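[job 0412] stage=fold_complex status=start
inputs:
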Amino acid sequence: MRTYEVMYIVRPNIEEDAKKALVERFNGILATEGAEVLEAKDWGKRRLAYEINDFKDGFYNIVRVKSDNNKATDEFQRLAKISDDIIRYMVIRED
Amino acid sequence: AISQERKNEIIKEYRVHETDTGSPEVQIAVLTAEINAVNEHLRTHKKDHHSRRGLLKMVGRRRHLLNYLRSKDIQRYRELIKSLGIRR
Amino acid sequence: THIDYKDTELLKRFISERGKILPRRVTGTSAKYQRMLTTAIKRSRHMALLPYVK
Amino acid sequence: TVVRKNESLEDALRRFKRSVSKSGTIQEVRKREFYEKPSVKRKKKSEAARKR
Amino acid sequence: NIENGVAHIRSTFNNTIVTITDEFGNALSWSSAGALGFKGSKKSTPFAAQMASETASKSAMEHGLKTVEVTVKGPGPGRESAIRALQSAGLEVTAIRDVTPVPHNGCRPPKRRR
RNA sequence: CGAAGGCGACUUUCUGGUCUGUAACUGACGCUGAUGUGCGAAAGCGUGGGGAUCAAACAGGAUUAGAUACCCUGGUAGUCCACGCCGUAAACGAUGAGUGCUAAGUGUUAGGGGGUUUCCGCCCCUUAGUGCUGCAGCUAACGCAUUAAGCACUCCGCCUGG
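[job 0412] stage=fold_complex status=done
writing structure:
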């Protein structure tokens, strides 16, 4: 029912597919489980404004979820600091 | 706190006439389930004290409809006391 | 319409150039116009698109 | 954060003192010297601003 | 070693110390700002940051660095008479930076002085 | 915004509640509000993160004619927060709460109303308010005057020398 649109970043020293295969684990979170995902805004070369992971680039990743349960974002919220590839998220909702 | 389709759901099953919103019985499941909402919703937030009087001040707004159910027609009050579960 | 926090181009003329936010009085907008633009600023500022300070 | 070059140091001193002037940096560390109470911080937020 | 560095000062209200260093801080020499016999209400001078500025600047003698790009990180009486007056040595001051600590309401600050 | 104590980097969760507009409906379903129940600012009785900064108590240095006072720090609980409260403030808008009516101008917060249009801005109707000046009436005067202390009605509470 609610439309959650998380915004994580990945480590921007990557290729196109192994980035997408990394967020394929996120597509198993933020596109499966009855999500009916409209789009996947995973951006390329933005510049990271401050020195998180001391990086030269930044690959912004807005992925929508849409569920009446809110499992996906808070699942990957509980995943994020544990793993060592994901850095951000910013979910939003609108009605 | 209460969604539009759900009140418009209970006017199908519990109205006294057509366009009868504001009825005594049309704020009982609206009252007590939204209590039962906030009964569990302030079970989460133990300091939801302003939302606590939100349902208690409309206990009397339904009770005055139960109070109004006496003087005009008492058989509707025998009907509506025995319709659902409300004490006293 | 509502301004999203990715259309910086019609938003950055309201910001301060050295890291901060300019107010609503010198910018010439209304209160709801400022406040919904502030959400576009805040979700840009806090989420690294606009910075805090550098 | 402002580099002043292609000149002498006088307008560079008059840039540094101006970059200090157009900033909530020296005013902020002037603001953050001691504590004013929130019963009296609104006396500053009214006698300088509600009269403006 | 020469031609690059940072003249890293933090010009306080008393005793504006000057430490010349590289662009990656290694502090070739520093100067205590009371080195001109300034003890009480005396290191708050223009001249604590005029000659004791060059008691380590003219007496650098180690890198021979000439492009300095001095950085200030605090308020003081010898602040404008530091960036001018580190160039009392005449050391081609180029890039002054007002990178001072501005906490977004950092802690609980102290009490008013009665 | 919140009844009030109050509420401040934010992103999200659960919500409260405010308000406008259309006003659909029930046919006054209201107000005071003794009892009762809550909140209840700060400090104090105590716990665990607290002693980083601040800081009672204590300390040091001198000034000063006088000290350790006005100057200064170090620093103890107390601090910060969570975990129990106590039931107190100039908790004052020094105005209890609900309803009718009598000069204005002036900004401003939200919704509805538009005329030109504007390249999103000018002018103006209205609602609810937030404010600032200001009749008649008022008081002892201050001052109030649509966010009445004016002109009327209902209820509670309180007062009558120090």
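[job 0412] summary: Residues 35 of chain D lie near RNA strand F (CB under 10 Å from a C1').
[job 0412] exit 0
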